Amino acid sequence: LLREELQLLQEQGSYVGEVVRAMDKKKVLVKVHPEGKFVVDVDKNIDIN
């Protein structure tokens, strides 16, 4: 069944980005790789701290 979970690789990708500093209202500021900056959201699992 783990080998039959191959429809997971076929979906999409994900970015690596650099954090400058966070701010209020559960958000951060990320300067991804070549581009500018983006105020984005956190997931449920990570700590803002």
């Binding site: 500093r21 701010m23 958000k27 500021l29 581009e35 500018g36 900056k37 983006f38 105020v39 984005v40 959201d41």
Partner: protein, 359 residues
């Protein structure tokens, strides 16, 4: 008995200050906004509630604005919030933070007070009455309608205590302190002097009541560097920008300026005119009385073995400064902890005298 009613009503006003549907309106503002809030750059503003921005690659868009935040917090050269899907102006972003500020602004209580200065008593009241008494006590000047003295030049031979005087003013203060050594106005790129000057005084005029202390500014003329463009015909333009920034246009404001030199005769006198700088203060090698205070205070916190006389050290050099006194009072301690001791004998001072002076 006004404490009870005053406290009750003031706490009611403070809780009504926190008492300022509504959650539905917050959710609607969050619906208008995108979650990946992208950052842009203004170039111009068009008055019809949509303006031009500039993305990080260079693409530029006529986009409207989600007008609840104050758009008039924004100027050319500002940072905004934009969308991915419509690129519209989500709103204002608070300002980026702050390498020039964090470098050039002394944040901390920065050393000892007027209990450490060695017997000046007349220069001190001048810098007192030029900075401290104006700023901390702005009540006398209203009575006479006389503007405070603007600039103060400290000068004199090296070792007399310009740096101490600046640190002591920076101790007892209520204003933001800004320190730039004057030798940092010589850059290896062309046209970098006026940028530093305009950023420095932009920081000063935007932040607070302030004290901009610019130290050893006389080395900007008498020190040519190989790590430079065309030297004197850029240095002169830098001095001219400093001049115009110091006493130019548009209601100068609450900015105090104190400068300190070794030599004064190599200065362009256009800085040294009044209107810019009103007080010029000499720092001479003092006497043979306040030296006793200097040796006393620089030996006030040590286990001094009482078999020494400070008058043996006063007579020693005819033109010693407080630099020499600090040097001997520390080198004797370095000789003391070389041999695991606490108290300091006479030959320690003899070796320290023969180490500091004649080498």
């Amino acid at each position: 008995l006004e404490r009870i009613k005053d406290y009750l009503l003031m706490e009611e006003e403070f809780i009504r200050n926190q008492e300022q549907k509504q959650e539905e309106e917050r959710s609607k503002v969050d619906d208008l906004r995108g979650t990946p809030m992208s950052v842009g750059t203004l170039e111009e503003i068009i008055d019809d509630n949509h303006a031009i921005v500039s993305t990080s690659v260079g693409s530029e868009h006529y986009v409207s604005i989600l007008s609840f935040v104050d758009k008039d917090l924004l100027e050319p050269g500002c940072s905004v919030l934009l969308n991915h899907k419509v690129h519209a102006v989500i709103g204002v972003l608070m300002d980026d933070t702050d390498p020039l500020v964090t470098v050039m602004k002394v944040e901390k209580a920065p050393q000892e007070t007027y209990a450490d200065i060695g017997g000046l008593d007349n220069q001190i009241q001048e810098i007192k009455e030029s900075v401290e008494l104006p700023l901390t006590h702005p009540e006398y000047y209203e009575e006479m309608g006389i503007k405070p003295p603007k600039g103060v030049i400290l000068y004199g031979p090296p070792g007399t205590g310009k740096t101490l005087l600046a640190k002591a003013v920076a101790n007892q203060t209520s204003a933001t302190f800004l320190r730039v050594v004057g030798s940092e106005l010589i850059q290896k790129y062309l046209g970098d002097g006026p940028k530093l000057v305009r950023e420095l005084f932009r920081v000063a005029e935007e932040h607070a009541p302030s004290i901009v202390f610019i130290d050893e500014i006389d080395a900007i003329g008498t020190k040519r560097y190989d790590s430079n463009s065309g030297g004197e015909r850029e240095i002169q333009r830098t001095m001219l920008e400093l001049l115009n920034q110091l006493d130019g246009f548009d209601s100068r404001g609450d900015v105090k300026v104190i400068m300190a030199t070794n030599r004064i005769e190599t200065l362009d006198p256009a800085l040294i005119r009044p209107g810019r700088i009103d007080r010029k203060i000499e720092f001479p090698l003092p006497d043979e009385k306040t030296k006793k205070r200097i040796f006393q205070i620089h030996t006030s916190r040590m286990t001094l073995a009482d078999d020494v006389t400070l008058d043996d050290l006063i007579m020693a050099k005819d033109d010693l400064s407080g630099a020499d006194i600090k040097a001997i009072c520390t080198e004797a301690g370095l000789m003391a902890l070389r041999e695991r001791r606490m108290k300091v004998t006479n030959e320690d001072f003899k070796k320290s005298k023969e180490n500091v002076l004649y080498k």
